[PDB]
Every structure is written in structure tokens, then in C-alpha cells.
Symmetry: C3
């Protein structure tokens, strides 16, 4: 349960968080587009 | 401090930034009613 | 490199990714604003 392993666990969560946020950004950007 | 602390600080900063961007996209959704 | 280096490098990349998303978000903020 080293600090290393704990941070590797946290980075896995960050990859997940970024995945969904990216997709949501893309969805809103597509919806609205340019004028 | 230390090399490991610098890393922990960056991981904290990452979690913070992500939360901020989540919040931002939430506010954008309100502006467009989505 | 080392276990520790490899994690350091993944964190930098994640900071790169977050900067990019911040800019995409900022762009969308302009797209849904008044013009």
C-alpha cells in the first residue's frame, strides 16, 4: 500500500474522469457548433 | 518536501482541475438548457 | 525508465490533456455566448 501504488490508483481514476469529460465536451460542442 | 511530494501535489492539482472543468461544463449546459 | 519516472511522465501527459480540455471548454463558452 505504498504511496506509489496509491498514486497509480488515483491516475487510473483520472483517466476515467478525463474520458467522460472529453466525451461530454465533444457532445456539447457538436450540439451547438458554429453560428 | 521530496520527489514523491511533488508528485502528490501534481495529482491533487489534477483532481482539482478535473472537478473545475466538470463544473464548467455543467454551467455551459445551463446556458444552453441541456 | 523507472516505475516512479513512468508515473511522473503519465502525470505530465494528464496535465497536458487537462490544459487542452480547458481550452476546448473556453472555446465552447464563446460559442454559447451572445453575438
Amino acid at each position: 500500500g505504498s504511496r506509489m501504488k496509491q498514486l497509480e490508483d488515483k491516475v487510473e481514476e483520472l483517466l476515467s474522469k478525463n474520458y467522460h469529460l472529453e466525451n461530454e465536451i465533444a457532445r456539447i460542442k457538436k450540439l451547438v457548433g458554429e453560428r
